[PDB]
Amino acid sequence: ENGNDFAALSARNLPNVSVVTSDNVSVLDVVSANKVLATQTALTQIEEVLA
Amino acid sequence: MKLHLKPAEGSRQVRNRVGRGTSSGNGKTAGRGQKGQKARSGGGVRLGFEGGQTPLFRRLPKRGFTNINRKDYAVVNLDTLNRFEDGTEVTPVVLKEAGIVKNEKAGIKVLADGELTKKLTVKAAKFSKSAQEAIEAAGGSIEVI
Amino acid sequence: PKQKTHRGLAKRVKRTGGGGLKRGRAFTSHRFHGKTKKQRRQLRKASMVAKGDYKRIRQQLARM
RNA sequence: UGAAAUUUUAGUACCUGUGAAGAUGCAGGUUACCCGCGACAGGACGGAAAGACCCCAUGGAGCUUUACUGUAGUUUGAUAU
RNA sequence: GGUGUAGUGGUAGGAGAGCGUUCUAAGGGCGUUGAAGGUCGAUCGUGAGGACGGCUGGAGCGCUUAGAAGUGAGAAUGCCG
RNA sequence: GGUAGCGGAGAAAUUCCAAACGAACUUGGAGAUAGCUGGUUCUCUCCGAAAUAGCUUUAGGGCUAGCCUCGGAAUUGAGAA
RNA sequence: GUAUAGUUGAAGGAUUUGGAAAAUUCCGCUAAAGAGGGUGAAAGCCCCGUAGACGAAAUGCUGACAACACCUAGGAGGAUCCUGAGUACGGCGGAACACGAGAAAUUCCGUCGGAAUCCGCGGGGACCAUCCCGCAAGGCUAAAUACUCCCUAGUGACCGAUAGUGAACCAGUACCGUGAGGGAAAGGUGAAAAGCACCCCGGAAGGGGAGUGAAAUAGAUCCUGAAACCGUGUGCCUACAACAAGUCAAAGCUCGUUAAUGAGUGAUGGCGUGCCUUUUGUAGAAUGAACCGGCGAGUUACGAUUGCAUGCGAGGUUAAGUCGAAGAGACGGAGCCGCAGCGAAAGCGAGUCUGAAUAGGGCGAAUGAGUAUGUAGUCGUAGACCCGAAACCAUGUGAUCUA
């Protein structure tokens, strides 16, 4: 979402996980993956930029 | 569709590499044939050269001049007005403002092609001697301001 | 860099709207007592493009 | 003890022809066991040097002149000191 | 997609489809019970070419889809050994 | 010890200026320029010519026109024998 | 606050193949650290590290805010005074402005003439008048801009020893020329030197045992070890034969494969003048190659045009620039292309030009679709497919040879 500094500092995991904020969502970050976890508010801030 | 990809059909050609053996079709002089200055390196004459025959531009005469004060307009004919239904003050603003006249050139002139059935009103900088009759036939109002 | 268009053809040829070019005739600025009177009437008026010379010239007059 | 120039691969005969028009190699006939050693220099259009002659390059360079355009220098006039 | 009729010499050149090398990405794999490279084989495809096995060898390399090129050698009186 | 390349020196020959002088050597513009030579690397399929006219300070070069190839459009019946 | 030394920093054992495991098979643990390097082969948990956290005696640098230096006043009047001189400007001769004397404004230079003072002076592309905008002939001035000899920390669909710097190695060295100058070749044992004690031949070099080692056919010219070239042994053939050296047919002799209409050799018979380049024509006695191996030629940037594909479509589309990981990723509508043409032009407009013409004719319109990016064919500017001259211009080096 934003500075979830206690939820973003826990993703230096296995390569199952890569982490992008709500602003830097590109195409190659999405098409390469198989599933996406996302919060409720990240969906809203996506629907502001992507109208 | 994922990383492990298809182009569209006919979307991307390959190349043609030249000078690689006598069965591709372009080995030994590369589609250039035998000798002559179309077949050297960097040869070929400049454009429009025809031997020493006097070419076409030195054969027919120079003509004309250019006005320094040519003032030409940014024509809209008449059907373009026919979607502003009734009462707008067509103008060098709000008329444009939807993608109609970007870059007016010296003020807007109006022409007479070909059918207007509204009751508009126009503010331009010039008019033809039939657009006024076409507008006032439909009952509008015009002013050259 | 950009191409440079020819400044001998810009002073002699103007482009129409159908695609061709207008051309001003020759033998008009010299002696006339040799020529007849049909000739000097019929050499006032402009002619069009011959499609031989439209090939080699096309790229020079790329925008004007 | 120990090189060099040359060198498409070669088991490399003669005659009369044929052939971009004088062939060891093509055609038709004659002659001819296999391998060397010393001598001669007819041929292999033999080897060395991308003609020392000629023509062309819309090639260069050096020289001459009443060929063209200039110029160092020499001279003459106005003006300044 | 059985089956008819027709066609398939070729230089300069135009057109179309494929073989192979090195690197990048994603997926799936092999390898001290022997990878790359070298040698031999009587094998497969219409072509460039691809497998499998025997010996040598001692640390990396294939396969599929797309991409980018310092992407292929027999000749220069080529350059180096 | 002196004389230097637009120059020097010459009892005169285009003679000498570090084995080379119709103008020394070295570096730089410089990957100078060449209508002229020689070369240019994997494969298959389909079609496949020209050596002519005109003009050219042009004649072994170029330009358009003719002959080849690829993609469209239009009635057709315009092509042929 | 920062630069130049640093401190600390989580978590694994056994089995199988091994010379040696990080490899394999079971069961665990860690992560604000799964970026990288090293260890007897390929490691999150062995080592050096990384994330985090902490730290400066000495010298330098940058902010800050104190002090001290500086600098800076209003309104009205308009008699008189001041406001940059051999300057402005002109003739002549040259240069600089995209502008080559051209109808030639504006800026300098050489020479010779040479003004005015606010009722003034300059400029608005010869020149004049009117209007408008400006005060030369005195100085100073940060940032946005271009470059990298060197330092620190990084990255690459960059090279892997003929490549990459000329130079991975004691390279501007050896060597060449009086001099200015020119200028190379040459990387790799194994993990650990454990680099072969001792015996025998031989003057020694060199070798054969015996050992080290997983391996010595890894023994120092030391990983792998192709080709030309030089040797040894052998299955088949060859001493009456004219041979571009092959292929087609084929008796005998030997051999046994990726198993199949097998392999080697070849007495004898038919047919048959190599490979390139250049040419009307080649076997040519036109022109090139001694052999093997390596290197060794149509590319990229900026534009133009056409075919194909994609998104919008009477519309399409951003640029420089700001924030962002040298990134996708949004703002940014100045601008450019199409939607209307004709005329040299004033202008007119689905119409216009010439013309006396409402005539005729040229060029237009009557459904008539462009634009942005990718990719490919061709062309232009750049050395533009590479190799090759005789010569030209500008700095330097030479009279130890010879005149």
Instruction: Specify the pairing of strand C21-23 against strand C13-15.
Output: antiparallel
Count of domains forming chain C = 1
Q: Tell me which residue in B47, B48, B61 faces C26 most closely, judged by beta carbons.
A: B61
Enumerate the nucleotides of strand G whose atoms come under 7 Å of any protein CB. 31-35, 277-279, 297-299, 301-305, 307-310, 314-317, 324-325, 327-330, 335-338, 340-351, 362-365, 374-381, 383-387
Q: How far apart are CA C42 and CA C25, in angstroms?
A: 10
Domain coverage including residue C61: 1-64
Distance of CA C62 to CAs B18, B69, C15, Å? Answer: 29, 26, 11
**Residue B29 CA, distance from chain mean position:** 41
Among residues B86, B3, B102, the alpha carbon closest in space to that of A29 is found at B3
- Beta-sheet pairing, B141-144 with B126-127: unpaired
Residue B131 burial by CB count (10 A; 0-12/13-18/19+): exposed, middle or buried? buried
Q: What is the dihedral of CA C23, C24, C26, C31, to 10 degrees?
A: 180
Q: How many CB atoms lie within 10 A of CB C6?
A: 19
- Torsion on CA atoms B130, B134, B136, B139, rounded to nearest 10: -170
Whole-number Å distance between alpha carbons of C35 and C30: 10
Place of tokens 């996302």: A38
Tokens, residue A23: 């602003």
Is A50 in a helix, a strand, or coil? coil
C12 — contact with chain B (CB < 8 Å)? yes
> Cα dihedral sign for C25, C26, C29, C35?
negative
Transcribe B65-132 into DSSP letters.
Answer: ---SS------B-SSTTTTS-S---B-SSTTSTTTS-SS-SSS-EE---S---S--EEEESEE-TTHH
* Residues 6+ away with beta carbon under 8 Å from B1: A31
